[PDB]
């Protein structure tokens, strides 16, 4: 029986807990808080704006996410950044999708 | 014929969502069909006594001016004069009661391990500090199930040592050890003013207690944006 | 801002308890620690419960002082009884920390 | 591109337009530290492990 | 005490009485976990 305390989707923290049960006796059960953080290793300060360089710092405040920028992309919401595309002398300002198969129109 | 005015507790308007006025009169002489005047600044009369004991073996006939009024009227700070009209007193005396702001600092503390080692029972406390109004009520609730009033007891208001204006109170729902260690949910709620919302729900469990083990699972994978 | 320490004690049949707090064996002023009056217990009317609440700075808590709660009662064989809290007074807190690089 | 441009590399983007894209435009970004990096310089800090 | 009794983790409180003590007597407690610093083991799995 694993209970999920909090879960920040775009940070991918997944703070969970479970009470392991030993033989019946005066209480010696080990309470544990189990987290599973997926570091990107390739994302930027903005995951949407390509101009920002690679981010080395990886900040994970547990209390801040239990209750802004983050590292992991989401599969539900869209990340759209404005991008310039030029054909000839003039230019047209167009949208783009940073990641594929995430929130394509249906 | 004693003269004294007692204000109803602010916990009454949260427990029953109503206000019940009461005048503190002790050992008034038993007389048939007594009348009591409880006048506010408007001077309106008070509704008659309800559920009173006309005959008392100890002759303690308390004169209670029971009535139902809105909380706005009492919160306005109006002067409340208890005119104790009686045959014995030709000129009744007047007694006045009135009330002249920080959010409650409420946190729930897990029980000690020594109590669990003793196996007799378990005691959990709910610390309510940092509140300027004198009165405060704490209710204990397990998954929406009300309890007996005598199982949990609240403490009298005492001045905070750091700040004389602030007050502190401790509330306990003492329980058995088995109900604690099987993971049954315990919630603490406070009914106090000077708060953004009406009540704040606070809970603690064995799982959400002191954790001994920590297996963080940080996967350094080039794949990103999938979870 | 600060750390609040409460002292849980129950079971007063004589119903007469005094609680004292000291640091490194040096008794503290009565202003800092306050003792609540005894009150009846739901399980047994004979047994009472009392509390002491100490208001100390959090930086002093992080130093790891003794913070003993001396409870004095007639029924105690030595007429006093104190317990010591510390930064690691509870479980040994073994860590299962892991780092995956798959 | 020149080699000194790749040194302290700037963000080079590949923007392509086609019918089958969801938003009709996609973008891929590479630099020195992303495309086949020599080293993975990361700083990983955790604070307040006790939580609330 | 026996080794198994020490394994059971009993209180084993030592109490000492003297006139110079503030309460004339003081107590201390020793267990198996009276020390036991936090155990950190790290895993590196790929
Ligand atoms: C990097 O992050 C900043 C965070 O503030 C972003 O700047 C703004 O982000 C909001 C979020 O959608 C946009 O609505 C604004 O238009 C952004 N500002 C500008 C000037 O574009 C943005 O993602 C990045 N910063 C910049 C300067 O591009
Ligand atoms: C931590 O260990 C327990 C086994 O006691 C396991 O069930 C749990 O999944 C582990 N946590 C993570 C994040 O894998
Ligand atoms: C870390 O310590 C715990 C405590 O005994 C142990 O169960 C766990 O297996 C240890 N981790 C590893 C990787 O050995
Ligand atoms: C965490 O500790 C438990 C002991 O209860 C052990 O079985 C488990 O393998 C540990 N987790 C690891 C080594 O990832
Ligand atoms: C690598 O990371 C460390 C710590 O974040 C930093 O001090 C150093 O400048 C970085 N070096 C490069 C080449 O990015």
Author numbering:
A (entry chain J): 3 to 69, 98 to 136
B (entry chain L): 345 to 444, 449 to 575
C (entry chain K): 468 to 569
D (entry chain A): 523 to 574
E (entry chain H): 523 to 568
What do the study authors state?
The predominant form of IgM is an asymmetrical pentamer, with five IgM monomers joined together by the joining chain (J-chain). The pIgR/SC-binding face of Fcμ–J is also targeted by the P. falciparum proteins, and the interactions between the P. falciparum proteins and Fcμ–J exclusively involve the Fcμ-Cμ4 domains, which is consistent with previous analyses.
We also determined the cryo-EM structure of the DBLMSP2DBL–Fcμ–J complex. When compared to the DBLMSPDBL–Fcμ–J structure, an overall similar pattern of interaction between DBLMSP2DBL and Fcμ–J is observed. Similar to DBLMSPDBL, DBLMSP2DBL also targets Fcμ1A, Fcμ1B, and Fcμ2B; and all three of its subdomains are involved in binding to these Fcμ molecules. These interactions are unique to the DBLMSP2DBL–Fcμ–J complex, and likely contribute to the higher binding affinity between DBLMSP2DBL and Fcμ–J. DBLMSPDBL and DBLMSP2DBL bind to Fcμ1–Fcμ2 using all three subdomains; however, despite this overall similar binding pattern, each protein employs a distinct set of residues to bind these Fcμ molecules.
